[PDB]
Amino acid sequence: LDEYAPEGTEDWSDYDEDFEYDGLTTARYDDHGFSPEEEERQLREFRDMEKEDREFPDEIELEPSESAIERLKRYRGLKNLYNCDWQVDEKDPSSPAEWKRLLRIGNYKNTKNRIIKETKNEAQAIAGDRIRMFIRFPKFLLEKIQDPKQLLFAVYGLLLHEHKNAVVNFSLQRWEQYDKPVPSQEPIVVQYGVRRYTIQPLFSQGSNSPNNVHKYERFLHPDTVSVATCIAPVDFTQSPAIFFKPSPTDAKNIELIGHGTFLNADHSRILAKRAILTGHPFRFHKTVVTVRYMFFRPEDVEWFKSIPLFTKSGRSGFIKESLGTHGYFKATFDGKLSAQDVVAMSLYKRMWPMPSLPWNG
């Protein structure tokens, strides 16, 4: 009866990447480079920020007093999200310690099927039987037990290793006739199988990746089915999963945000915190474009030399040198860009799931 098995400590013993970002002169691109009022205000702010995210995906506004290097130091500068060699077993202070303490199952489907036929073979009692169970049980949970003839008391069995936390991925479909937003960091009560757990799930798109790297969605996509990544006890039956929030304001104490099914119990799924820097190209020549309002120090431009530029018209490019001392810099682009286009910079960060707790009442 432990969520974190002692065997999880001896499984993930080989620390591969222990990279220190403090001893870096350039960005990490060495692979390819050189009470009701508070709730109302919070709901309004979340809706406005979701609308801003829909209009502008991941843009960050930089300040003249803001230093880009110190606040953007841990980010990376990879050119392609689905081709780069991301690693899952990196050591990071932002990672939870219980990432060390997880059960790492290799293949979900084969292990799940093996456990299902094991439960076929090792069933001591056959279905449909009048059976007496003596169960170990604490004293305090006795004093909220009611009589079974007035309220249903059902007993549900658990498979092998279902009590143990692991990184799990859920299907997430937006339930109809709620236009209300939901971020990827708020707690949400999730009922799967029979068990209810409070889960703060990371939202991602279910597009397949060769390196199993997926974009972290800040909010739920209102149109397409997303994938919710979290740390939770596993289910080996692929049970449908339901998602809600308890608020006693309604007659029902349920606001039902979504529905779905248990997709996978896989630890290889990481998420990418993407940070975008957007701005207007100042001046245009035949080959060299002088770009304005990226940074405010030329040494920031030097630190951002290797990471490529991209333009929302669909055109890649690179930097050449810092023109002025206010962030003006020369750059080379694939095509000819006007003043109505937006030049932008992409930075990427590792994102880890968070642990979950059971829900009662």
Tab-separated table of all heavy atoms in Angstrom, residues 118-127 129 131:
chain	number	residue	atom	x	y	z
A	118	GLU	N	-3.051	-12.580	-17.074
A	118	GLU	CA	-2.658	-13.049	-15.746
A	118	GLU	C	-3.845	-13.029	-14.786
A	118	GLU	O	-4.010	-13.938	-13.963
A	118	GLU	CB	-1.494	-12.216	-15.205
A	118	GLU	CG	-0.134	-12.630	-15.764
A	118	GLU	CD	1.031	-11.984	-15.041
A	118	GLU	OE1	0.807	-11.309	-14.014
A	118	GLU	OE2	2.176	-12.156	-15.508
A	119	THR	N	-4.685	-11.993	-14.882
A	119	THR	CA	-5.900	-11.934	-14.074
A	119	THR	C	-6.938	-12.947	-14.546
A	119	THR	O	-7.799	-13.367	-13.763
A	119	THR	CB	-6.470	-10.515	-14.079
A	119	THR	OG1	-6.724	-10.092	-15.426
A	119	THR	CG2	-5.521	-9.556	-13.396
A	120	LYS	N	-6.890	-13.325	-15.829
A	120	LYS	CA	-7.655	-14.485	-16.283
A	120	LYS	C	-7.205	-15.752	-15.569
A	120	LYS	O	-8.034	-16.511	-15.055
A	120	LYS	CB	-7.506	-14.686	-17.796
A	120	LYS	CG	-7.972	-13.587	-18.768
A	120	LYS	CD	-9.494	-13.419	-18.876
A	120	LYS	CE	-10.056	-12.366	-17.963
A	120	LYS	NZ	-11.503	-12.166	-18.186
A	121	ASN	N	-5.891	-15.990	-15.518
A	121	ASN	CA	-5.391	-17.266	-15.016
A	121	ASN	C	-5.457	-17.356	-13.494
A	121	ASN	O	-5.773	-18.418	-12.945
A	121	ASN	CB	-3.958	-17.498	-15.504
A	121	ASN	CG	-3.866	-17.603	-17.012
A	121	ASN	OD1	-3.002	-16.994	-17.641
A	121	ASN	ND2	-4.770	-18.374	-17.602
A	122	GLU	N	-5.162	-16.261	-12.791
A	122	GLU	CA	-5.000	-16.294	-11.342
A	122	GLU	C	-6.222	-15.767	-10.592
A	122	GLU	O	-6.077	-15.120	-9.550
A	122	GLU	CB	-3.748	-15.519	-10.932
A	122	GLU	CG	-2.478	-16.006	-11.607
A	122	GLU	CD	-1.316	-15.049	-11.432
A	122	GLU	OE1	-1.548	-13.908	-10.981
A	122	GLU	OE2	-0.171	-15.438	-11.748
A	123	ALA	N	-7.425	-16.033	-11.098
A	123	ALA	CA	-8.660	-15.656	-10.416
A	123	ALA	C	-9.074	-16.790	-9.484
A	123	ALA	O	-9.532	-17.843	-9.942
A	123	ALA	CB	-9.759	-15.344	-11.427
A	124	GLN	N	-8.913	-16.578	-8.175
A	124	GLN	CA	-9.270	-17.608	-7.204
A	124	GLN	C	-10.780	-17.808	-7.128
A	124	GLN	O	-11.254	-18.941	-6.985
A	124	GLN	CB	-8.708	-17.252	-5.828
A	124	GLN	CG	-7.197	-17.103	-5.792
A	124	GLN	CD	-6.705	-16.460	-4.509
A	124	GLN	OE1	-7.417	-15.675	-3.883
A	124	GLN	NE2	-5.483	-16.792	-4.112
A	125	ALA	N	-11.547	-16.726	-7.217
A	125	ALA	CA	-13.006	-16.770	-7.152
A	125	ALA	C	-13.549	-16.445	-8.540
A	125	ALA	O	-13.107	-15.483	-9.175
A	125	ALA	CB	-13.539	-15.800	-6.102
A	126	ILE	N	-14.491	-17.255	-9.019
A	126	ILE	CA	-15.086	-17.039	-10.333
A	126	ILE	C	-16.207	-16.013	-10.200
A	126	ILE	O	-16.633	-15.690	-9.085
A	126	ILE	CB	-15.578	-18.370	-10.944
A	126	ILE	CG1	-15.482	-18.337	-12.473
A	126	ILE	CG2	-16.997	-18.696	-10.500
A	126	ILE	CD1	-14.063	-18.258	-12.995
A	127	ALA	N	-16.670	-15.478	-11.330
A	127	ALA	CA	-17.688	-14.435	-11.312
A	127	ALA	C	-19.036	-14.983	-10.861
A	127	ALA	O	-19.379	-16.140	-11.121
A	127	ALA	CB	-17.817	-13.807	-12.699
A	129	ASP	N	-20.390	-14.964	-7.475
A	129	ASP	CA	-20.312	-15.802	-6.282
A	129	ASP	C	-20.617	-15.017	-5.012
A	129	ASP	O	-20.240	-13.852	-4.887
A	129	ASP	CB	-18.926	-16.437	-6.147
A	129	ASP	CG	-18.696	-17.558	-7.134
A	129	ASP	OD1	-19.686	-18.152	-7.609
A	129	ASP	OD2	-17.518	-17.865	-7.407
A	131	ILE	N	-19.490	-14.258	-1.632
A	131	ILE	CA	-18.170	-14.359	-1.018
A	131	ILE	C	-18.115	-13.436	0.194
A	131	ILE	O	-18.666	-12.327	0.169
A	131	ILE	CB	-17.048	-14.020	-2.025
A	131	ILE	CG1	-17.167	-14.884	-3.278
A	131	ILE	CG2	-15.670	-14.277	-1.434
A	131	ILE	CD1	-16.983	-16.355	-3.024
